[PDB]
């Protein structure tokens, strides 16, 4: 050992705090670390498994009540509510937690000493035996690897894009937000009750399409709440705007959705109806980044490949991205001279799977409001898309793919 390999990890946010918890177990590595709700597929289960966290998780994070608890969504029209297909991911289903307290189970299995709190950098600079994080703080740390997990707005990005000679990324608003509310089961069910409707739309997950927009819904406490996520789409613009300085939540008014939703039968108007609060949430991403590493410093998690939610994928690649790094660095044949060109391994094998799952994912949001080209509201042929279309991401081996951690070969 001699010395330990020294790996800074900045940003706190399940990325970032799970390669810390990665790292950890190491040892031989020296690790320090400086929507209000998500969802995790099965490909993020063998990652969350081997954090250590299977067991816990699978009792704080909210499921469907059985029997349909493998069910990932139905998927309906929205008009009459009607049954275009089904997506069901057996054992996980709809899993999904609170992010506060994910988060939190991470950072407090985390043994001592490598939580880092008041610094955030501003900057970075570097050798190719050093590299220095500049902290507002007026301090410095030094590393042999700065691993950036600061999220959608990564101050860190922008100065690893500049430096590898690449124009600067920021967040681009989507065009579409979201309406979110949370409502109680018994409220709707009475509801559903008093106009004849089918109080299975309650039981199991469901998503409504319509055009420009769709309203999806998951029980949670086991059962006894509603998660409504009600999404609008203007496409109008080819390039849309958020005013220069709002913040990406506000509050708004049961009819501001409902207008959107003109087109809708009563269950879903009902179930927007039921909101009695709505927020409002505009959804951000940005266009895949050239690449996600220079010298000394890479990029994980939103910072990296920030996405719409139409796939329930985001977190799940920041783990897959967490995992993998865990196990690129941490293995104990690797030391600091190997960093340049382990970090581009990285690259090579990570980059195109989480843009593909950025685009993906924006692809998804067309699907959902009738937008595709070739199906747009077409029922056979949504059905077959949405009901196969998830298996490229859920079904990947990460066990393999952590083989690929290694230096190269030249061989
Ligand atoms: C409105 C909204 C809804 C979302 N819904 C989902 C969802 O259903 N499923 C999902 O997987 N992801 C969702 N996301 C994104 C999800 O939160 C991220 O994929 C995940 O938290 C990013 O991991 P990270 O390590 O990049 O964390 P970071 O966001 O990078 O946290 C780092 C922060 O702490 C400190 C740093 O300076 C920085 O500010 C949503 C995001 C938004 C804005
Ligand atoms: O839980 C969510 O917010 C979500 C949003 C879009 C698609 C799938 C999802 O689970």
């Given at each position: 050992s001699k010395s330990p390999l020294r790996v800074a990890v900045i940003g706190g946010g399940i990325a970032g705090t799970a390669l810390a918890l990665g790292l950890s177990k190491s040892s031989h590595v020296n690790v320090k670390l400086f929507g209000a709700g998500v969802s995790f597929g099965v490909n993020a289960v063998e990652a969350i498994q081997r954090l250590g966290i299977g067991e816990l998780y699978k009792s704080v994070a909210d499921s469907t009540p059985a029997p349909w608890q493998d069910i990932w969504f139905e998927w309906r029209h929205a008009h009459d509510a009607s049954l275009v297909?089904?997506?069901?991911?057996?054992?996980?289903?709809?899993?999904?937690?609170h992010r506060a307290d994910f988060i939190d189970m991470l950072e407090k299995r985390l043994p001592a000493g490598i939580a880092s709190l008041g610094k955030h950098v501003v900057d970075?600079?570097?050798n190719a035996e050093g590299v220095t994080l500049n902290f507002a703080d007026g301090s410095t740390y030094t590393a042999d690897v700065a691993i950036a997990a600061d999220g959608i707005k990564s101050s860190m990005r922008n100065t690893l894009l500049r430096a590898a000679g690449h124009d600067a990324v920021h967040p681009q608003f989507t065009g579409t937000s979201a309406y979110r509310g949370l409502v109680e089961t018994s409220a709707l069910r009475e509801a559903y009750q008093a106009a004849s409707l089918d109080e299975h739309l309650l039981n199991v997950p469901q998503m409504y399409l319509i055009e420009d927009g769709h309203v999806l819904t998951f029980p949670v406490k086991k059962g006894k709440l509603i998660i409504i996520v009600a999404f609008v789409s203007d496409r109008s613009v080819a390039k849309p705007q958020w005013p220069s300085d709002q913040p990406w939540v506000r509050p708004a008014?049961?009819?501001?959705?409902?207008?959107?939703?003109?087109?809708?039968?009563?269950?879903?108007?009902?179930l927007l109806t039921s909101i009695k609060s709505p927020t409002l949430w505009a959804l951000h991403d940005f266009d895949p980044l050239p690449t996600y590493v220079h010298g000394r410093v890479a990029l994980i998690g939103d910072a990296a490949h920030a996405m719409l939610?139409?796939?329930?994928?985001?977190?799940?690649?920041?783990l897959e991205d967490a995992?993998?790094?865990a196990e690129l660095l941490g293995n104990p044949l690797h030391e600091a001279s190997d960093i340049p060109a382990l970090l581009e391994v990285y690259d090579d094998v990570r980059r195109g799977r989480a843009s593909k799952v950025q685009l993906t994912s924006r692809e998804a949001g067309e699907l959902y409001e009738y937008r595709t080209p070739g199906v747009?509201?077409?029922?056979?042929?949504?059905?077959?898309?949405?009901?196969?279309?998830?298996?490229?991401?859920?079904?990947?081996?990460?066990?393999?793919?952590?083989?690929?951690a290694v230096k190269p070969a030249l061989a």
């Open positions: 297909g089904a997506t069901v991911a057996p054992g996980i289903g709809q899993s999904s937690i970075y600079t570097e008014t049961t009819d501001e959705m409902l207008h959107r939703f003109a087109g809708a039968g009563e269950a879903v108007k009902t939610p139409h796939q329930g994928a985001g977190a799940g690649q920041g995992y993998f790094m747009e509201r077409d029922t056979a042929k949504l059905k077959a898309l949405l009901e196969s279309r998830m298996n490229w991401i859920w079904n990947y081996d990460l066990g393999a793919e952590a083989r690929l």
